[PDB]
Design a binder for this molecule. Structure first.
Ligand SMILES: Cc1cc(Cn2cc(-c3c(Cl)cnc4nc(-c5cn(C)nc5C)[nH]c34)cn2)no1
Length: 252
């Protein structure tokens, strides 16, 4: 289908930054509510990285999973490019983590399970999302977790694996790492490697240096230690993750 800007009525801005902005949009002749991520070619030619975007569009267009934000279609005028995305009713995991300060183990273990199912789906298609962080985690009408953008899929350091930040070439286990980083943050409120400088964060991720606050339970600490280790090969498969005792005992 061929789209134009004059097919959508533009509404409330949901998010800013990254040389583009998303507005809550309702299409006119069927009243469909969707999110319209609007990037500008001027700022994108200066970035000069349509490369992964055209791929990300292709990546996300035919990805059909209930825990992945569906991308409907693309179109553009001269100066800007529109990505027509599914609308997430309940917002981001980021702001909700911001408000609750921390998640109790049930909301956390549930969030992990949904991520794994979405990743096991992406891993079934040899897709690696790389940039998994709370900012691109969204919530559906039922409040289900939904993975968002794949612009950096096939910088900001905190969720990137040791092998990835150093130069050795990734594999799909880099999401197992990111999963481990997410689980920690959900329970603590902060990333395991969060630092004050890039050069310093880089070291902590490289030496794998993190410590558990005293309120994080034993079963929790176990799963995080298995996911967040230097050697990718001995990291669990998403199967082993879902069937983790602590995951099973708290997920729903
Ligand atoms: C460029 C660029 C990236 C972003 C990040 N961003 C994504 C959203 C977003 C998307 Cl893609 C889809 N559905 C959303 N629903 C919300 C939302 C709902 N509530 C109640 N509050 C918010 C926020 N955000 C969505 C927003 N930002 N922005 O520009």
């Amino acid at each position: 289908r061929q789209w134009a800007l004059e097919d959508f009525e533009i509404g409330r801005p949901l998010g800013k930054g990254k040389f583009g902005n998303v507005y809550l949009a309702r299409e006119k002749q069927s009243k469909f509510i969707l999110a319209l991520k609007v990037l500008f070619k001027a700022q994108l030619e200066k970035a000069g990285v349509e490369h992964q975007l055209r791929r990300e569009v292709e990546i996300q267009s035919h990805l059909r999973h209930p825990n992945i934000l569906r991308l409907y279609g693309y179109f553009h005028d001269a100066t800007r490019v529109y990505l027509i995305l599914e609308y997430a009713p309940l917002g981001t995991v980021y702001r909700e983590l911001q408000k609750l300060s921390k998640f109790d183990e049930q909301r956390t273990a549930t969030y992990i399970t949904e991520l794994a199912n979405a990743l096991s789906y992406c891993h079934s298609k040899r897709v690696i999302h790389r940039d998994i962080k709370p900012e691109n985690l969204l919530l559906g009408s039922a409040g289900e977790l939904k993975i968002a953008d794949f612009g950096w899929s096939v910088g900001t350091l905190d969720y990137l694996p040791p092998e990835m930040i150093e130069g050795r070439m990734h594999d799909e286990k880099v999401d197992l790492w990111s999963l481990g980083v997410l689980c920690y943050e959900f329970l603590v409120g902060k990333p395991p490697f969060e630092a004050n400088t890039y050069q310093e964060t880089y070291k902590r991720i490289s030496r794998v240096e993190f410590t558990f606050p005293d309120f994080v339970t034993e079963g929790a600490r176990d799963l995080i230690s298995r996911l967040l280790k230097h050697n990718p090969s001995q990291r669990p498969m998403l199967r082993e993750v879902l069937e983790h005792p602590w995951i099973t005992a708290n997920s729903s």
